[PDB]
Symmetry: D3
Subunit: 57 residues, 6 copies
């Protein structure tokens, strides 16, 4: 299983690796899949690259 998470940029390296760890675990439990097969890729977006209603985020 492969997860691509899209988030707003600005966060520390501290949280984003925890995210990888926390999300990978949730996939493994939910789908009874071995953790070693779970992939997480994070993509960050700049202020001018994210919209919520036609307006910037």
């Amino acid at each position: 299983p492969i997860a691509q998470i899209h988030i707003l940029e600005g966060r520390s390296d501290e949280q984003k690796e925890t995210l990888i760890r926390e999300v990978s675990e949730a996939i493994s439990r939910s789908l009874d899949a071995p953790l070693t097969s779970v992939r997480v890729i994070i993509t960050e977006y700049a202020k001018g690259h994210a919209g919520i209603g036609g307006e910037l985020a």
Copy 2:
């Protein structure tokens, strides 16, 4: 935050309902973000549509 999770087809609706929730909870936790802003998208793949080494899954 937006999570697109790619999984092999074969799971029950029950399992996939758990996946969305557990992953959503993990994301809210990891990024101290309000849960109500978290979105999850599941995409299922048939075995003949997924490869691991050039070989099917």
Copy 3:
């Protein structure tokens, strides 16, 4: 330019034909880009495959 649009399933082919045309025009228009270079691909998601707060839509 390539647009991947993620929507809940349930619309008619007509609405999706309108979506492709109207979104394509806006991209060509917004980026002063040739319309003929614009690609749009729609991905529909079943009700049990989309989350908003860890819960279904």
Copy 4:
């Protein structure tokens, strides 16, 4: 609904913000969906990261 737009880098911040506004509106009309539920995320690609026929763009 969630729209992912993949574009070549080099354009100004002014053009990319208009895109979010205009693409969002197009989605809202085409699918008779409330505008505030529409999300847009822009991804730019360096010239050496985009192909049209096996050749760079």
Copy 5:
């Protein structure tokens, strides 16, 4: 590395199995990365879910 290939629907399982192997090897080849680390996922699109120039494919 993860490859997501977006194609028009209508092709045989034979062609898509050929696609996965040939594309995986090309990636493993280009980047001197283990073939066994290569993942490929295919997503097919119906006539009414793909646009070029705002018109259906």
Copy 6:
């Protein structure tokens, strides 16, 4: 046809130039589609943005 390739950063431009050309050709053959219609986009991921076992890559 569109290929989205997700790779870890650190490789040279010549390798990625090879990748786009080489991968584009593989898709064209496999699906007997004109090469000039094949498009490829590469997305690179930093050390802290990729997970494989819940641990960084």
